Amino acid sequence: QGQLVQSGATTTKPGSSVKISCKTSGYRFNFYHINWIRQTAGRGPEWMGWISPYSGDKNLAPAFQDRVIMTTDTEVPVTSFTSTGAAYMEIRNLTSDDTGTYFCAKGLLRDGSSTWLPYLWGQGTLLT
Amino acid sequence: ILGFLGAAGSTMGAASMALTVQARLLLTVWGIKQLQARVLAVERYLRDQQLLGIWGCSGKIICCTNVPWNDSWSNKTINEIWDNMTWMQWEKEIDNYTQHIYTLLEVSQIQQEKNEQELLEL
Amino acid sequence: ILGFLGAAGSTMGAASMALTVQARLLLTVWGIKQLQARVLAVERYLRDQQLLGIWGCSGKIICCTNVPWNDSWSNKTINEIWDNMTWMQWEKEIDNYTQHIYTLLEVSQIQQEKNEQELLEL
Amino acid sequence: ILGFLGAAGSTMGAASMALTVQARLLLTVWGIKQLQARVLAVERYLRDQQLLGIWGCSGKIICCTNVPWNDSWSNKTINEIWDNMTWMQWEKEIDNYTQHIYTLLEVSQIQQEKNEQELLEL
Amino acid sequence: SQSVLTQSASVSGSLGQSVTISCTGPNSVCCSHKSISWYQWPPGRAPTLIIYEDNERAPGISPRFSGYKSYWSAYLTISDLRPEDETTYYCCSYTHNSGCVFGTGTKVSVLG
Numbered sequence: 001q002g003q004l005v006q007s008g009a010t011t012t013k014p015g016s017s018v019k020i021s022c023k024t025s026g027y028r029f030n031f032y033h034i035n036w037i038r039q040t041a042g043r044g045p046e047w048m049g050w051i052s053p054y055s056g057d058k059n060l061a062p063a064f065q066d067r068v069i070m071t072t073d074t075e076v077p078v079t080s081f082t083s084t085g086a087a088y089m090e091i092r093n094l095t096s097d098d099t100g101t102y103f104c105a106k107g108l109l110r111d112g113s114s115t116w117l118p119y120l121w122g123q124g125t126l127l128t
Numbered sequence: 129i130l131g132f133l134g135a136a137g138s139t140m141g142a143a144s145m146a147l148t149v150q151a152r153l154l155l156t157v158w159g160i161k162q163l164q165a166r167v168l169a170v171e172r173y174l175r176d177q178q179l180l181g182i183w184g185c186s187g188k189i190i191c192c193t194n195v196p197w198n199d200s201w202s203n204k205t206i207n208e209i210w211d212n213m214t215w216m217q218w219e220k221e222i223d224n225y226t227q228h229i230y231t232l233l234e235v236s237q238i239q240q241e242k243n244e245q246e247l248l249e250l
Numbered sequence: 251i252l253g254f255l256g257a258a259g260s261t262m263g264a265a266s267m268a269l270t271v272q273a274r275l276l277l278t279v280w281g282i283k284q285l286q287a288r289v290l291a292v293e294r295y296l297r298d299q300q301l302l303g304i305w306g307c308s309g310k311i312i313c314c315t316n317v318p319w320n321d322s323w324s325n326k327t328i329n330e331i332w333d334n335m336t337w338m339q340w341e342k343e344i345d346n347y348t349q350h351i352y353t354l355l356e357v358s359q360i361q362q363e364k365n366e367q368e369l370l371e372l
Numbered sequence: 373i374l375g376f377l378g379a380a381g382s383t384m385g386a387a388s389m390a391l392t393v394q395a396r397l398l399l400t401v402w403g404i405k406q407l408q409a410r411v412l413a414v415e416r417y418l419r420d421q422q423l424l425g426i427w428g429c430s431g432k433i434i435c436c437t438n439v440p441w442n443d444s445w446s447n448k449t450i451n452e453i454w455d456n457m458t459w460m461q462w463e464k465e466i467d468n469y470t471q472h473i474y475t476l477l478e479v480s481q482i483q484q485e486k487n488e489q490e491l492l493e494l
Numbered sequence: 495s496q497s498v499l500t501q502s503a504s505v506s507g508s509l510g511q512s513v514t515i516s517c518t519g520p521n522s523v524c525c526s527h528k529s530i531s532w533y534q535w536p537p538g539r540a541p542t543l544i545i546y547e548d549n550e551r552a553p554g555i556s557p558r559f560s561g562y563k564s565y566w567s568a569y570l571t572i573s574d575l576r577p578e579d580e581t582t583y584y585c586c587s588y589t590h591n592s593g594c595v596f597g598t599g600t601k602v603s604v605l606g
């Protein structure tokens with residue numbers, strides 16, 4: 001029930017690395033995972049991996065394990081159930097194959113079997 | 129588990145387990161003040177036991193009843209309550225209808241022992 | 251219904267319905283007097299709960315037992331009691347034997363959990 | 373029977389019968405002292421009722437449970453306990469493990485209404 | 495594209511009618527041992543969780559959308575086609591400690 005604003009549209013060239021932000025608000029940032037998804041021109045959507053703002057635990061697909069730098073800050077509490085945090089996204093070996101729109105997605109629940117499911121999406125950032 | 133109120137910021141499904149931990153620790157200027165707080169402690173406690181009694185829950189920690197969940201109280205699913213909201217989040221959302229459901233539990237208990245009394249007439 | 255003690259001059263059959271209304275409102279010179287009445291209120295209340303407990307009625311509002319109605323207490327029919335006399339009329343007529351029936355309910359409860367204890371031995 | 377504490381030096385099998393006798397009589401310098409003892413009397417009593425409640429024994433005088441008798445507490449037979457030792461002899465021998473069994477009864481009651489809650493889900 | 499979880503390619507419908515979209519793959523990603531999530535996804539924009547855990551709807555999802563999962567495929571039905579349904583729908587297979595294995599996509603046209 002909050003916003004997940006991201007960075008702008010930064011376009012570099014292959015071999016480099018790009019940093020993408022994801023500033024949260026309106027919800028307890030520590031209670032829900034932060035997923036990272038992308039839709040490239042060449043495939044469809046592809047799940048990259050989620051990170052736990054509380055457990056500090058990461059799980060990412062083997063297709064993006066040795067490329068992605070994924071971190072979070074620590075929420076700045078606003079009220080008892082509101083906070084403001086940030087998740088960051090980087091990649092190693094960059095090409096024009098990874099060109100596409102990228103968003104972050106907050107988890108669905110806090111317990112059960114669909115805890116991390118990307119429910120609340122960001123806005124999208126266009127890569128190289 | 130976690131201790132007294134240990135799962136206050138936890139999901140309602142996790143906090144609902146092992147509720148006997150917040151059930152144990154519920155019960156001259158210094159002397160009068162201390163005796164004042166001792167009498168009040170038994171009054172607030174017996175009010176909850178008085179309520180559990182006239183609901184058929186006298187002795188229960190989890191107590192199912194007959195009153196159906198009116199969606200006017202909350203149109204949320206069971207999964208988006210017990211696996212998401214905390215016990216302090218939930219009853220702020222129900223705070224208004226809390227006095228309405230106390231009346232519903234009492235009539236469903238007086239219309240249960242009254243149907244039970246006719247049952248044992250045979 | 252009628253409120254607190256609303257059916258005091260009504261028939262025992264009408265007053266016996268919705269008994270949770272007289273069950274809710276049962277529980278320095280000004281300060282000592284007020285605290286004196288607060289402690290007494292919990293004592294008189296717990297005495298009734300103590301009695302309901304050692305009768306198997308702990309939690310009941312209407313509680314059937316095993317003790318048969320001795321006609322020496324009252325040779326009146328059920329119809330000329332519940333549809334005629336009021337609750338205040340009735341217990342003046344039973345006032346004498348009231349202490350005799352309190353003893354009968356207690357032995358019928360200690361000779362019920364003792365027969366229940368042998369039941370679960372198998 | 374024998375009265376209040378009448379079977380204190382009797383066998384545990386004889387004293388276990390008619391336990392409603394020690395269950396009834398359980399509940400300014402003179403004034404403050406007398407009110408001090410009145411409040412303490414209700415506190416000590418409700419602690420025992422609080423314990424009986426979170427064990428499923430709320431209302432019971434003899435209450436069987438699920439916790440098996442660990443022979444580490446006492447390797448004595450039932451016959452050499454209930455027909456020989458007195459109630460004051462017994463709990464001196466169990467005095468150490470008494471706080472261990474209070475914890476066992478509480479988890480066997482929270483893991484009984486929780487299995488009961490899933491039972492009524494169907 | 496290399497999505498092991500194939501969908502119903504494309505499908506059409508009309509206002510007031512109901513559609514159905516397939517979503518099946520090999521035994522490595524489907525189905526009796528995996529949950530199925532359904533996403534409404536306009537072209538390269540803000541997605542929307544329609545249905546999770548086979549048949550469960552997200553908060554506020556219209557009662558039109560339904561879910562079903564047999565032992566080899568999962569189905570997404572769009573009852574009572576309203577005009578605002580022209581988009582592409584993706585499925586995803588997942589457990590509790592895994593990730594979304596997305597689907598190939600299915601464009602739905604409501605032209606009528």
Ligand SMILES: *[C@@H]1O[C@H](CO)[C@@H](O[C@@H]2O[C@H](CO)[C@@H](O[C@@H]3O[C@H](CO[C@H]4O[C@H](CO)[C@@H](O)[C@H](O[C@H]5O[C@H](CO)[C@@H](O)[C@H](O)[C@@H]5O)[C@@H]4O)[C@@H](O)[C@H](O[C@H]4O[C@H](CO)[C@@H](O)[C@H](O)[C@@H]4O)[C@@H]3O)[C@H](O)[C@H]2NC(C)=O)[C@H](O)[C@H]1NC(C)=O
Nearest residue numbers: 030031032033052055057059110112113115137138590591
């Ligand atoms: C405070 O609030 C936070 C946030 O709400 C709570 O953290 C969340 O707790 C829930 C449930 O406790 C978590 O959901 C579970 O997620 C696990 C996934 O863990 C598995 O995979 C991880 C990554 O692959 C891995 O780290 C785990 O391995 C262990 O090691 C890490 C070390 O980092 C350790 O921290 C872990 O605890 C693990 O022990 C593990 O392999 C998932 O498996 C769970 O599903 C199981 O359990 C549920 C029932 O709970 C059941 O329905 C399933 O079928 C399955 O059996 C479950 O989904 C969630 O991930 C946590 N984090 C979030 C939401 O960000 C925290 O618990 C709260 N604490 C208190 C005290 O209130």
Ligand SMILES: *[C@@H]1O[C@H](CO)[C@@H](O)[C@H](O)[C@H]1NC(C)=O
Nearest residue numbers: 196197198199200201225228
């Ligand atoms: C729900 O509550 C309202 C009053 O708040 C009442 O009018 C209505 O009949 C109730 N409906 C159900 C289904 O309980």
Ligand SMILES: *[C@@H]1O[C@H](CO)[C@@H](O)[C@H](O)[C@H]1NC(C)=O
Nearest residue numbers: 201219220221222223224225
């Ligand atoms: C309870 O009533 C107040 C009236 O001022 C209202 O503002 C509030 O929204 C109500 N609670 C809920 C949960 O709707």
Ligand SMILES: *[C@@H]1O[C@H](CO)[C@@H](O)[C@H](O)[C@H]1NC(C)=O
Nearest residue numbers: 318319320321322323347350
């Ligand atoms: C009735 O009570 C009297 C004593 O008041 C007793 O002697 C008699 O046995 C009782 N009879 C029945 C049938 O209970």
Ligand SMILES: *[C@@H]1O[C@H](CO)[C@@H](O)[C@H](O)[C@H]1NC(C)=O
Nearest residue numbers: 323341342343344345346347
């Ligand atoms: C109770 O005992 C008194 C003894 O003085 C007697 O007068 C009275 O009639 C008795 N009550 C009834 C209902 O018989």
Ligand SMILES: *[C@@H]1O[C@H](CO)[C@@H](O)[C@H](O)[C@H]1NC(C)=O
Nearest residue numbers: 440441442443444445469472
């Ligand atoms: C008995 O109690 C001890 C601890 O006092 C425990 O280690 C043991 O497992 C128990 N055994 C049984 C059979 O209950």
Ligand SMILES: *[C@@H]1O[C@H](CO)[C@@H](O)[C@H](O)[C@H]1NC(C)=O
Nearest residue numbers: 445463464465466467468469
């Ligand atoms: C209880 O513990 C004390 C420790 O000082 C020990 O001496 C005593 O024997 C124990 N009780 C029993 C019944 O073994």
